[PDB]
Amino acid sequence: PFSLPILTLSELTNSRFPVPIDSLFTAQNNVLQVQCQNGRCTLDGELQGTTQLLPSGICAFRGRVTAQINQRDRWHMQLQNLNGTTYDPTDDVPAPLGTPDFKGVVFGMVSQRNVGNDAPGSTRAQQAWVSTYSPQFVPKLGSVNLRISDNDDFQFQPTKFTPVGVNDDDDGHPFRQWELPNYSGELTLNMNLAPPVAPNFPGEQLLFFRSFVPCSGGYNQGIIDCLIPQEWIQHFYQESAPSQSDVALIRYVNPDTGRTLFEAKLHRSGYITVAHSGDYPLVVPANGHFRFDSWVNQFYSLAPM
């Protein structure tokens, strides 16, 4: 029988950036498509897009630095899969699993640990940035280029990128959470994408699990919204409960009082809709959580949120 894990918002991890969930948010419908590639999973447990299971994999890279070029995006990083295995560009994914799914700069740290004949075991780490606007951001082809703070202490050796936050670039390239990067560079279409999501019933809007992630300068709010949290993804992967219909009715409950605060539709393809009109940050008690009620269908009419 299908179920959700029992977890409060502060016990949940954002599936599009590795931080806790801060709040719930419903957004007004708009012509601009929602088509994130991280945090995508069906209710019967099929991961989609660039989604993988580990919070520490989200927006991370692993590989070898193999060259440098005379450009701002200086250091060429040939990618592996996050578990260290060889990346195959012909696999049926948009990019290596964990790759960022938005336009912007991800900041964090790079670390290296030498192998082979040149000082094996020697290490180093420093601040780095990955711009997903860069012409050298071509993860589907098997590489990205890094900007680092100290060009004199970086070798052609195995490298990991650990994300900390996001920002706008300079030069007029803003942080746009709903714009997909070009995974294969400038004139090539993205492939094998998880499909766009949108409400289909009148009066319905998407409900998001929202985080305010760190930024590295200026005034950006750091908003990253996901469809379902990483812990639900991990749970659906395990259970693989056959979905009885296209829509699971779920209720947000206060476990202390025992009462239901509102209801929502959890769709088979892994997103939530609510009956509401307008942008609204939800105000709900800190102990609250969703519970599965019953299988319904597309025509089920939700009580207003």
Ligand X SMILES: C[C@@H]1O[C@@H](O[C@@H]2[C@@H](O[C@H]3O[C@H](CO)[C@H](O)[C@H](O)[C@H]3O)[C@@H](O)[C@@H](CO)O[C@@H]2O)[C@@H](O)[C@H](O)[C@@H]1O
DSSP class of residue 194?
P
* Residue entry with tokens 């056959």: 242
Closest by alpha carbon to 217, among 249, 170, 263, 185? 170
Q: Tell me which of its own copies, ligand X, none is bound by residue 258, counting a contact when its beta carbon lies within the kind-specific cut-off of 5 to 8 angstroms.
A: none
CA distance 240 to 290: 19
Q: How far is the CB of 150 from ligand X (least distance, A)?
A: 6
105 binds its own copies (CB under 8 A): no
Backbone angles phi, psi at 231, to 5 degrees: -65, -30
Q: Tell me which of ligand X, its own copies, none is bound by residue 184, counting a contact when its beta carbon lies within the kind-specific cut-off of 5 to 8 angstroms.
A: none
CB closer to ligand X out of 81 and 126: 126
Q: How far is the CB of 20 from ligand X (least distance, A)?
A: 23
* Residue entry with tokens 């082979």: 116
Binding test (CB under 8 A) with its own copies, winner from 23, 111, 254, 269:
111
Segment near its own copies (CB under 8 A), from 49-57, 248-256, 262-270, 292-300? 49-57
Listed in sequence order, the residues at least 6 apart from 284 whose beta carbon sits closer than 8 Å to its beta carbon are: 24, 252, 261
Largest CA distance in the chain: 66
Backbone angles phi, psi at 59, to 5 degrees: 65, 25
Binding test (CB under 8 A) with its own copies, winner from 234, 236, 247, 302:
234
Q: How far is the CB of 232 from its own copies (least distance, A)?
A: 12
Q: Tell me which of its own copies, ligand X, none is bound by residue 127, counting a contact when its beta carbon lies within the kind-specific cut-off of 5 to 8 angstroms.
A: its own copies
CB closer to its own copies out of 132 and 167: 167
Token couple for 104: 């912007």
CA distance 140 to 220: 29
Q: Tell me which of its own copies, ligand X, none is bound by residue 32, counting a contact when its beta carbon lies within the kind-specific cut-off of 5 to 8 angstroms.
A: none
Binding site for ligand X (CB under 6 A): 122-124, 153, 217-218
Binding test (CB under 8 A) with its own copies, winner from 5, 45, 89, 185:
5
Identify the H or E element spanning 119: none
CA distance 39 to 37: 6
Token couple for 264: 């929502």
Binding residues vs its own copies (CB under 8 A): 5-7, 10-11, 13, 18-20, 53-57, 82-84, 107-109, 111, 113, 121-127, 160, 162, 164-165, 212, 214-222, 231, 234, 238
